[PDB]
A paper describes a structure:
The replication of RNA viruses relies on the activity of RNA-dependent RNA polymerases (RdRps). Despite large variations in their genomic sequences, viral RdRps share a common architecture generally known as a closed right hand. In most dsRNA viruses, RdRps perform both genome replication and transcription without the need for primers; during replication RdRps use positive-sense single-stranded RNA - (+)ssRNA - transcripts to produced dsRNA, whereas during transcription the produced negative-sense RNA - (-)ssRNA - serves as a template to produce (+)ssRNA copies from the dsRNA template. Although cystoviral P2 RdRps catalyse the same reactions, they have distinct template specificities.
The full-length φ8 P2 structure (residues 2-636) was determined at 3Å resolution by molecular replacement using an AF2 generated search model. The overall structure of φ8 P2 is roughly globular, consisting of 24 α-helices and 19 β-strands. It has a typical RNA polymerase fold and resembles a cupped right hand with finger, thumb and palm subdomains, which together form the active site of the enzyme. Despite the low sequence identity, the overall fold of φ8 P2 is similar to that of φ6 P2 (Root mean square deviation (RMSD) of the Cα atoms over 540 residues: 2.1Å) and φ12 P2 (RMSD of the Cα atoms over 534 residues: 2.1Å) and displays all the conserved structural features of RdRps. The main difference between φ8 P2 and the other two P2 structures appears to be in the first 50 residues at the N-terminus. Within the thumb subdomain, a notable variation is observed where a compact loop consisting of four residues in φ6 and φ12 P2, is substituted with an elongated β-hairpin structure spanning eleven residues (β2-β3) in φ8 P2. Because of the high concentration of CaCl2 in the crystallisation condition, a Ca2+ ion was modelled at the non-catalytic ion site of the φ8 P2 structure. The Ca2+ ion is coordinated by the sidechains of three aspartate residues (D323, D446, D475) as well as the main-chain carbonyl of lysine K479. In φ8 P2, the presence of Ca2+ ions could lock D323 into an inactive conformation, coordinating the non-catalytic site instead of the catalytic site, that hinders its ability to catalyse the reaction.
Author numbering: 2 to 636
The structure:
Amino acid sequence: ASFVPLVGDPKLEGSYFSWVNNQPSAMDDYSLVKTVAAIRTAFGPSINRAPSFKDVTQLVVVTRTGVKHYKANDPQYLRFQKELADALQQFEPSKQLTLGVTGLGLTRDFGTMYTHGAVFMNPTLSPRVDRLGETGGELPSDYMLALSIMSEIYFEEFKPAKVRTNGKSKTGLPNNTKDAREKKKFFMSLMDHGTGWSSALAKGDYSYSAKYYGSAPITLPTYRDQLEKPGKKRDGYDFLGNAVVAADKSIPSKYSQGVDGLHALRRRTAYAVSYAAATPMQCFVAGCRHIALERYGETWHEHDAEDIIRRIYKYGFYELYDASAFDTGFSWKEITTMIDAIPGITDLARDYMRSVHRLPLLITSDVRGVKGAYLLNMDKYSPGLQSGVPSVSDFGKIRGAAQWSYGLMVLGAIRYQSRAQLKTEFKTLLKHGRPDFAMQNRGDDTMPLAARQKDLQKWCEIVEGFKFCKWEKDTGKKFIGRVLYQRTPESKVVAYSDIVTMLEKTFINERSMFSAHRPFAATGNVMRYEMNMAHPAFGAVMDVVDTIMLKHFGVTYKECFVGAQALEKELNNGVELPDYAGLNQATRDFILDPDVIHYKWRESDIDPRVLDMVMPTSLEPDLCEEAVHKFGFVK
Ligand SMILES: [Ca+2]
């Protein structure tokens, strides 16, 4: 009972079907029918719909006479986008000085600006269960030791912390509501079950979850759109299991509106783990995250752009590396090694955290026009690092630093005689106590630091040769979203935000302006304008933008969004965000992208006034402390 047809009665590929049949069914017929009825009661349209295209409002023009919404598929907006993209081709990636790019702070041209804001590629590359978690090369014993020690350091101390859940997100199953009031009542009821709920999920007994809440905890694969360079080919798998070599990026005539030269959006696959399964794990994970990012903030955290540059000049030489398929090559052997290394949690907590990583998947269609869906009753499979797991940002920070700390063990700078001493020399490296080596890591983004340039080249040569992970030099020289700029070889190095990203998140956005995910779109575009005024490439790029903005809309960049601020405040029931002068940069970046707290800043770094308006639910530290004990996780 592993494969469950749901909508179009799809037929998987043989290599996939014969493998799924050999896998034992995750749920018995009692819980399966109870769950199938729940994924049909809810997700009615989402399960029976075809991909088609997107309905996104990209620009809202406020005039004395009227207000016009320009969508991504509007013909007048596509002619503006085509002309602005052509007018921005005069810019090219600038030269890189010893310690950063110079001249115009451009790490890439405005090429992605040809991406059609409403059309995504077909087929949207979908995950494949039997080919996930592949490491390729063997995992060394010294690396698995460093990975266990890095995880032990990260989850060494637990201090109950405030857990906020996005009010724009669903709860999945069993309970399915965006309501903030229902989300907390649903968690209080889960506390009353406590060990009975945790033991059922830790044993793969999804019948208990269906007895009291009507369904079983499943993970829903969601979509996250992205812009793409022209001529980029995407290879992957089909939602039936077939293999796609070159995902079609062409724009159909109904959507191109005659505007040639455009290509389609890349649609990445995300995961939406059940709120019932993720939240109890989040109540413990959040308690250790705010400690790890504070004790060892020299590696995994930051307070402002001036902390990165200061750590750079403390050692002298740096490089920038990105991990190729970091979440895809996340083997299950590495996950359990990190889970088993966590001190303070019971064996019930370890088995509970494993089941959250690999919940049964409800696969939906990606082929354009083909409406179909099925439920993979899979409990024991290598899932990689699903983006919905509460510990995705923390396991990424652990594995990334453990792979570079293993490179120093191969290099010989870190020689180990015991676990207790290796844990100590790792703590010193993380706190940047070593005078010769350090690093700044944020998952798949790592900047190794060294006092001698030849020491850094040897260290980077080692991690590139690793076969269990692909580390490649970042050609863009961006860390997080920070461009490293150096005016002249004599001037100091300054960090700037990429100006290409400003126009990306303004004219080719993922979600509509003033929508549920972007309630402060006008004010958010104003902050990007004022922030990037000091950017070296601000005068040249905005002279081009304002020229094309006036030619098609009769309003400049700042005029367009300052006038829309009056419309924004009215649409949000007079709710006025506090002026950015009183907010920190963490709150600033959280206003632009609400999904910043999940990858960059902490929940305690956001101002409480702004944090309450976006995140309605909030589990207090005393409620999390009661939960982690009631569920039976803490020893
Ligand atoms: Ca980078």
